[PDB]
Amino acid sequence: AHFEAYSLSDNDYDGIKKLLQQLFLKAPVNTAELTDLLIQQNHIGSVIKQTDEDEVFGFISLLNLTERKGTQCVEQIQELVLRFCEKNCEKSMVEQLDKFLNDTTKPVGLLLSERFINVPPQIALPMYQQLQKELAGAHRTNKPCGKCYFYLLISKTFVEALMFANAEEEFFYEKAILKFNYSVQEESDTCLGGKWSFDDVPMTPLRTVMLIPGDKMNEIMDKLKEYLSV
Structure with missing residues (x-):
């Protein structure tokens, strides 16, 4: 029934490695x-x-x-958001993605926002409210984390026109300029000696990749507050 928020500490490595495995389920990324x-x-x-x-x-x-x-994980990820793009890209977004990733006028920050389905979605509003202040303080102090001008978000989604897992990232989607989708659904195998196999998954779990400009953030907050208000 009660939730609170703390800085990351060593204590939390296991539980946060658990959440990150759930995002990169079979990816090469070293979580x-x-x-x-x-x-x-x-x-x-x-x-x-x-x-x-x-x-x-x-x-x-x-x-x-x-x-x-x-960095290894940083690399493994940038390599994976491209390699899954090529399978769904039309070859022009593969070109915009690699150029965004290496810009350095406008560095790119990865946003990681993963929770257990238990937690009521309305928590998102305090949680993002707190992040924004942490961004302002880090941009006053010229930390890397506040110098970034693009947000790269990778969302648990699926299609039963597309459901968002956390469900407030939909407001992040419609402001993303470059967006695309890759399936994370596991392939089916021929257990019973068949020529091919198919699985009846009404879900099709997938992962939406989004790039958001930093300045449209203020406006996304505006939609969080009205929709997520108590």
Whole structure:
């Protein structure tokens, strides 16, 4: 029944590695490394807990990629948001994506916002309200994390025209200039000696990739408050 938010600490590595596995389910990304990297920059991380009694029920952090260039997980991700683009890109967005990723006039920060389905969606409004202030403070102090001008968000979605898993990222979608979708649905195998197999998944779990300009953020908050208001 009760939720609160704390800075990332070492305590939280396991629960936040669990959430990150749920995002990159079979991806090459080394979530151990990514988790380690988020906790180190505790000056922008928030972790949600419910009131043994210290399990991580969700988390939120922003990682500035252009700034951490060279890094294994950072690399593995940039390589995966491109390789899945090529399978759905039309060859022009593969061109816009690689150029956004390496711009350095406008670095790109990865937004990570993953929670357990338990937690009521309305929590999103405090959670983003807090992140924004953490962004302002880090942009006063010229930290990497506030210098970023593009938000790269990767959303759990699916189609039963598309459902969002967290459900407030829909407001992030309609402001994203470059967007596309890749299936994360696992392929079916021929258990019973057939020529091919098909699985009746009314869900088609997928992952929507979104790039958002930083300035449209203020306007996305405007839609969070009205829709998510108590």
